[PDB]
Design a binder for this molecule. Structure first.
Ligand code: NA
Ligand code: NA
Lengths: 216, 214
């Protein structure tokens, strides 16, 4: 079987969800945009995660701070060359961590999600994006994983807004703050960003695994 | 890469969770117990789900009422031969639907989960079983999917109890039944068992999730 690993890497910028895409310099679906991803390299990859982090770093020059397996798709119809299997990951990083290393490259671009949803993407990659986007919605409901799409440190209004974008729905500021404070997942830097001086926070590592039992 | 699919199939019987294991007849780990699973056959499988259903049916003679993809494990250390990838599924079925078939087969059997968790198993199948058990705990928190591990029709107490076993603690008998009745997932057969109601799962039980934890 044709066995690949792919990643839907999201960030948040100006002021929408953006998804990292790579133009296919390679037949089939040649010249079309699609997910970063590809083949396992046994000489440098020791696990599937190392495979997907390498494929991301080959494009961004950064290992993203958040990554999680989404799904594995495999069947005899998604790819014209043969039965193929793709292990798909979701990732999150901040926009400026790698826009500094990605301006200078023409086959790698951050695309507005809305734009992407109207594009002719290679293979079944549109469908993988939709699945990733939907899992992100659940992350907005049960975690602070959306914080990984922001540059560090961030304000709590920033964090709230990313969650609102994902749920497509204004959310209840004071409930949110209450849940954040009790999760005990943010480090208050003691710094301020100012028409009000807002506290600047970093994510604790354990944000990645922490889940609220009740929805937002 | 060696590419397989595996399934961790659970059921509920004798007030305990069981897991289906299959005894290996070939190397490596020849003679070790492990998950049902193996290679894609492009001649009969059109998708990964068809592969794993075949791997299970080959052993149980029964297509399970519930199956969900769990995770894909791939590394150069779970198999001594080299780089190895396995797409794992979780599945649930009733004990009685396949016990009557696997009773007669020496290399396939339901094992007590608590015992299996302490066993030497083929490859990394113990880790796979642990991760599936963990995932089932979430199902107990957010769905009625644990019902698929029961013979149909079943009673509410019977249903509440598999959730309790999965959760590892008792549960409020009034808030559960409230939860269940608002979800609208059970069909009342109008039939009774000692006089507790007997219910069937609605097919959409597989996909319905509760917003609030149990
Ligand atoms: Na670029
Ligand atoms: Na047997």
């Amino acid at each position: 079987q044709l066995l690949t690993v792919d990643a839907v890497l999201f960030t948040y910028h100006d002021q929408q969800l953006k998804v990292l895409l790579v133009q296919r310099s390679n037949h089939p679906f040649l010249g079309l945009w699609g997910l970063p991803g590809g083949f396992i390299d046994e000489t440098c990859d020791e696990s599937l995660e190392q495979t997907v982090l390498r494929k991301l770093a080959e494009k961004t020059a950064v290992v993203p701070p958040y990554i999680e397996q989404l799904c594995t798709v495999g069947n005899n119809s998604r790819d014209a060359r043969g039965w193929s299997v793709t292990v798909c990951y979701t990732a999150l990083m901040s926009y400026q961590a790698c826009q500094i290393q990605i301006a200078s490259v023409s086959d790698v671009k951050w695309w507005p999600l809305a734009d992407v949803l109207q594009m002719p993407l290679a293979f079944d990659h549109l469908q993988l994006i939709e699945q990733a986007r939907e899992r992100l919605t659940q992350k907005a409901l049960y975690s602070l994983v959306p914080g990984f799409a922001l540059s560090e440190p961030f304000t709590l209004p920033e964090l709230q807004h990313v969650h609102e974008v994902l749920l497509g729905k204004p959310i209840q500021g004071k409930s949110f703050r209450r849940r954040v404070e009790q999760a005990d997942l943010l480090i208050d830097t003691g710094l301020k960003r100012t028409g009000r001086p807002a506290n600047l926070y970093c994510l604790k590592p354990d944000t990645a695994s922490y889940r609220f039992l009740r929805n937002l």
